[PDB]
């Protein structure tokens, strides 16, 4: 996309100013050698005027108040070339200070990489790393005011430049060794803050952490507390440590599975279409494979799909006993279960992967006929018989055909 | 307002106290010069004492027990004019430190300033800009002790002030420099008070940013994890990477139109008489737009209207199809739908922007006469068949209309 | 209370031992003079073994396993008198470092004052100030430590320990000035592990704080992100501002009132038996000062009163229009309505503070007779049409009753 | 599990050289004497790739696409011995700081570890101890570069270790006392990227510490918090202070018996058949104890079973008075209550642990014969008559057999 690289190269220029210009204000002999930069880059600063505008159109346009607005009001500010004019008229300091109005184009641009970033990105670890960006730049232009406030000497620039850095990072990680410290008066104030400010921007990075690991493993600490309540209310009601265990083993499986998701919880957050499809092919030529449901509609067939009740049974667990009266069937999703008798001796069958049992019970109110077993966790969807009737009330022609 | 005024004037004066008092404190030579504002100061420090009395009386008076209780109780202890007489009389240390119980006033006008800016500041950030101004006002006294237990010399007063507010601004924000350090033990019991105060109060300042973080994009966290959770579930029941990155827009449809918000949520949130309202002009004139609902009582409207129930359909998705037995009506809000055949080859019609489709079946159980599918995200709200027999029974007299 | 003032007696004892017991490691002299103390305390100390043991079969004794078990196990090994026996002997440092077993007594003052104070106090802020209680005592430990790391010399022993507290809360705060510092091998190894050890408790300090604040406003917080969550979907829907000035003012009146909590989410808290008196003394001779349910059985007035249904009314707000059907009557609470024509130009009467109105409806199906608009907030009750109905069918004498 | 104790010797391996690595990068004479080891790390460091992919096959193998992925790739590539071979050359720093490759099998231990002790450790607690446990192998490693970039000196190895282990803990834990301080210009380099790096790992601590204390009473918390949100609604509600007490006890038993949690919504955190059991053996042999359920299919107690609610009566409250029309039963779980006249003067019996009353309204619609009243908190159970008729339309035989 032009849009994406375009934004990239702006960027990559306003991260270039903001490393450049206190340098440069610093060092006012490192403004000619660069001068071909600077220029490109203020092309940029004004060539990003009216395509933000344009790259805004694009995505559902509706209102562009430039030139007013919290928004494109610092975009716009830092996109006059002062700094070039500053530089090239060589003013003091009070007046040349006004060159750090081009780096006002920063929060435009931690906005842009927000909206380019926040969808494979977490909001948290985006604001975290725009923080530690800024706050880099931020380092630099302190330990460029740092050096704005030593006293002239020959040291070697890159060296003092190294001693400043030092100063503030010192400074802003609240480590604070010492070793190098304010002399003047005006370096006090300027450190007093810089240490404010430091010590905010680091509060600032130990929030936005705390933010981030608190719901590093939302979903495992919801399911771990979820499953500390029910174990707790349980021990209360002096359940049986058997029960007990089935219950934690239960759990476990579920999380295992299903990162501890309820089914109809998530189902829940879908709307009737995507719900409809998702509930269809789950059950994908899995609820029509049935004899019951063939020849039926496909209108028939999605009114069974979105009124299926998903239910897990774990291993050794009685889904359906032979004899008991029997409300409803049941389709495997992923598990297995065992067909056996009343006496459950005799394995009758073996039914895993898609195909279903005790669907006598949706055509009469005998009981059933023989126990169905689980072999291990079941994961398979109840259909009840008071739901089939209901839904088989306003379909009057399988109504008469599922007597057959 | 008067009252907000008043507080803004109040706050103001306190702020002189808290800056003067421990600055006048060290500083004897200071009192005599700003004599002249305490008094006026004083006069508003008594003035306080009715007026907040009678400002709380026009918001809900009910009961005022002043003189007693948490509450008014450090107002009227900071109201008395303590600090005139003691800087008169100058008496020592030990006793005039006593002038600090007109600073007792600053929890009264944080809470002040809490209630007339709790609606539109976040309590959080309101909290955290509190804690910043006493962290400040707090510094400044820390200061002003620091000189009080300074050795006597003839330094000039700012720069001897300038050094105290450097060291309490590295104590505060646990830097600690070490250049200037304590040297006699009173200084050194200062320090270690202080060193437990900066931390305590730099603590408070970073949990402060962490809640305040912690919250910062709570919708597009919660979206987003809603969205993890949804695409989790969808991966363990081997959904299709098509309905995948479909559900995938959806979500993303939703996020950037109502931030990922549930309309059905968000209306159980409101009341009856409010909900109704918002869901009559949310359908403003697009309700009464059918012919059904023509010559219809308001009503029968308002029955229809909160018994509606929103849906998003997405791009290429099929609402009801040709030869569906169809239970159900459809309001398009702000989507677009194409009504074509069975065969959907010949286009029938478009329609958006508060029209309708599927009337028929809310009249007669005929299947559908074409198929309608959703050019983009429909946004349309759902009315059952079921429930609109549920509301026509109770009014006979549009039941019989609506044979016609 | 025996049990509580024995409780304190044992914390007191408790403290004073971690405040003695290193500090007389560190100066064996102070031994003699605080022997009559030590085996009082030390009394206390065994005294403790079985009233404890009593304290806790009051308070549902079940099962004590004393002597074993994470609990219980510390208290009694801090029972035994060892430090009495090793500062009798004399015995060097690697040996009567075992003294500190006295301490162990620690965890369980923690815990017993958790249980007499989980009540009136924030399980938050009561961990944070045993946690603050702990670093005090583990920083009077820490600098002792550093004491018995120091070289010997014949600096007082007042002043040595205002040093070594002043470079234990350096640490422990990391704040470390760093003027005074390890010199030996062992003072640095000892520095290393404080150094650890503070920054873990600075860290707990720091998340403690940030646990308290992240609650410290959450009905505040949650109003105002339900609020900006209706907001945000009320301006999707392109909702008229008026609309959306009247919900805000609504939610303004909400939380001014109960705290934005929703009236029923808060009964269903409630068990029968409560919600059953909660709504009877809400509607306390309210519910029977209307006629139709004069002369009825309680149990009746009990089957309206569960089915009651709160609603708010904003000022301005038709509760029934003259001429609507009509399938509700209202209890107002505290709020007024007033009683117009169906031109709302006549005021028939203004109902407020416990009276009725709509009761017509309750026993025919014949329209209003008049409009009723809420002149403010009403708070009132609805009961519907149907769930009198409902209610009534299994009330045969009453149901024949209210025909007059 | 041979699995386990394998993980547990990788993760010493790993932490051995992690300890090792750079201490012999440091220190090359350190390399010959522990030769024999490495080579049986190395071996063990390549016995590690197929028993993982082994490992991970016996659990779901699935896919195991080793060689690639972000799983498993670091493994591998830690897994080569390039420590032996650049340690045998001698290769100058810049080429022989590739041995730290070794190193980064440190992420799959970490990440094996938290497989293997997810279930009984806390998430947020294990994430803290591997930081912490990383923290402590990087200050190793940070110590080890602290001498690499040190001025040569005769000074003993563990004595300058030691000097760097306390300058890297007093730069990871931002104390930075000062007395050791860069003194070179890549010393200071390294001290500002180190400083960088421990301000982001004490946030990374501080953060966790947090997520670890903001749940740490996650139930006390959500409890006292529903308890605020009751007693501030009946609080406007002016409801009477002696049923504000009597709810504060009752929220006091809940909290003290299931820790606040509502037993409906623990159960529907159980599937069906677990809840079926759940509720089966919490009413074991209970259920079956009353007549009018004796001599009946096990199905139907189970159908009486899943539709018993659960409600808790506080002392002195009535569940059921004399003359009360009656339209459910109760079973007592673990409560006590007395039936008594309609007078509540003669006690008729005393009921607790597993008996029942009301059931004559199970079988007529008469009023009650006699008071119920609760002796202390009951949690009995409530099954309604109307339940108890729909579950009863589907057995016809104890339909007619329940006549008796
Ligand atoms: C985003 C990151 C932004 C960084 C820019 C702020 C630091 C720039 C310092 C330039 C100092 C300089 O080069 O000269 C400032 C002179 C001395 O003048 C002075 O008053 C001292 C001014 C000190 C810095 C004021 C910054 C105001 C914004
Ligand atoms: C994006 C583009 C960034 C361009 C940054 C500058 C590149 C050129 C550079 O770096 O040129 C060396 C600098 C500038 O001054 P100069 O030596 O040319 O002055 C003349 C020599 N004289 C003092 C003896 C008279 O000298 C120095 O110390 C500057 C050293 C580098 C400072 C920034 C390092 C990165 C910081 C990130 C945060
Ligand atoms: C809200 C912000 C409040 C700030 C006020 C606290 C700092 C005031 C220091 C005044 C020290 C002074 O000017 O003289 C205190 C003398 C020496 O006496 C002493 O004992 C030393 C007392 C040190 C400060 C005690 C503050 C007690 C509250
Ligand atoms: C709101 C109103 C606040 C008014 C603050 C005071 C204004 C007057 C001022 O500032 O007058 C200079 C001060 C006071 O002492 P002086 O020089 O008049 O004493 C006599 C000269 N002598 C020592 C040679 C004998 O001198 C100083 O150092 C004080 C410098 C300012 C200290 C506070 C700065 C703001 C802090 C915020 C937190
Ligand atoms: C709860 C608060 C608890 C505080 C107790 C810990 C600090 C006690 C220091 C006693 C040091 C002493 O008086 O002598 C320790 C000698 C030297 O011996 C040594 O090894 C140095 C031992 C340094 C402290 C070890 C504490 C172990 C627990
Ligand atoms: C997990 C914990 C991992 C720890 C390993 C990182 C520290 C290793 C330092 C080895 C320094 C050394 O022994 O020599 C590095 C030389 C000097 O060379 C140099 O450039 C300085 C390199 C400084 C450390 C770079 C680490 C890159 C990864
Ligand atoms: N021999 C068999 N082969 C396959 N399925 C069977 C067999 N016997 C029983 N079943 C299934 O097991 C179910 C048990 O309950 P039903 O008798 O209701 O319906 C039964 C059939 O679905
Ligand atoms: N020619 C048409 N012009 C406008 N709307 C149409 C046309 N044909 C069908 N529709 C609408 O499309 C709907 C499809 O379902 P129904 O047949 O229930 O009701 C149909 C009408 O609402
Ligand atoms: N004159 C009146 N005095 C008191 N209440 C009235 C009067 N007229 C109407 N109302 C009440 O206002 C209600 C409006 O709706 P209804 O007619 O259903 O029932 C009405 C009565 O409860
Ligand atoms: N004498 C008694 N012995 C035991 N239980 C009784 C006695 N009298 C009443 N009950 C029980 O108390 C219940 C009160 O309500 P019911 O009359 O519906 O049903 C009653 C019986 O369950």
Same mark, same amino acid.
């Given at each position: 996309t032009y849009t994406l690289v375009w934004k990239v190269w702006i960027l990559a220029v306003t991260?270039?100013?903001?490393?450049?210009?206190?340098?440069?204000?610093?060092?006012?002999?490192?403004?000619?050698?660069?001068?071909?930069?600077?220029?490109?880059?203020?092309?940029?600063?004004?060539?990003?005027?009216p395509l933000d505008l344009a790259f805004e159109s694009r995505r559902t346009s509706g209102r562009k108040p430039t030139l007013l607005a919290p928004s494109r009001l610092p975009d716009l500010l830092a996109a006059l070339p002062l700094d070039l004019l500053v530089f090239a008229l060589h003013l003091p300091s009070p007046l040349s200070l006004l060159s750090l109005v081009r780096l006002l184009k920063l929060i435009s641009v931690q906005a842009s990489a927000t909206r380019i970033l926040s969808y494979r990105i977490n909001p948290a670890l985006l604001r975290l790393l725009s923080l530690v960006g800024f706050i880099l730049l931020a380092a630099h232009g302190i330990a460029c005011g740092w050096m704005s406030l030593q006293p002239?000497?020959?040291?070697?620039?890159?060296?003092?430049?190294?001693?400043?850095?030092?100063?503030?990072?010192?400074?802003?990680?609240?480590?604070?060794?010492?070793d190098i410290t304010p002399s003047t008066p005006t370096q006090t104030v300027y450190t007093?803050?810089?240490?404010? $400010?430091?010590? #905010?921007?680091?509060?600032?990075?130990? *929030?936005?952490?705390?933010?981030? +690991?608190?719901?590093?493993?939302? %979903?495992?600490?919801?399911?771990?507390?979820?499953?500390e309540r029910v174990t707790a209310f349980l021990s209360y009601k002096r359940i049986s440590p058997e029960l007990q265990r089935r219950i934690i083993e239960y759990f476990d499986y579920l999380w295992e599975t299903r990162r501890g998701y309820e089914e109809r919880e998530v189902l829940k957050?879908?709307?009737?279409? $995507?719900?409809? #499809?998702?509930?269809?092919?789950?059950? *994908?030529?899995?609820?029509?494979? +049935?004899?019951?449901?063939?020849? %039926?509609?496909?209108?028939?067939?999605?009114?069974?799909?979105?009124?299926?009740?998903?239910?897990?049974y774990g291993p050794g667990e009685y889904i359906i006993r032979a004899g008991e009266m029997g409300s409803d069937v049941y389709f495997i999703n992923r598990g297995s279960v065992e067909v056996l008798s009343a006496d459950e001796k005799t394995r009758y069958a073996i039914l895993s992967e898609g195909q279903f049992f005790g669907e006598m019970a949706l055509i009469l109110r005998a009981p059933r006929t023989a126990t169905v077993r689980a072999r291990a966790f079941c994961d398979l969807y109840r259909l009840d018989k008071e739901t089939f009737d209901r839904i088989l009330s306003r379909y009057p022609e399988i109504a008469a055909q599922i007597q057959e």
């Open positions: 991260l270039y100013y903001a490393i450049r210009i206190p340098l440069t204000l610093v060092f006012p002999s490192l403004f000619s050698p660069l001068l071909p930069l600077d220029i490109l880059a203020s092309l940029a600063l004004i060539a990003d005027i002239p000497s020959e040291n070697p620039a890159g060296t003092r430049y190294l001693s400043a850095f030092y100063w503030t990072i010192t400074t802003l990680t609240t480590i604070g060794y010492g007093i803050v810089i240490e404010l $400010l430091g010590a #905010a921007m680091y509060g600032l990075v130990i *929030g936005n952490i705390a933010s981030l +690991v608190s719901k590093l493993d939302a %979903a495992k600490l919801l399911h771990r507390e979820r499953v957050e879908l709307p009737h279409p $995507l719900r409809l #499809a998702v509930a269809m092919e789950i059950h *994908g030529d899995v609820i029509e494979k +049935v004899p019951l449901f063939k020849g %039926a509609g496909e209108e028939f067939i999605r009114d069974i799909i979105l009124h299926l009740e998903p239910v897990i």
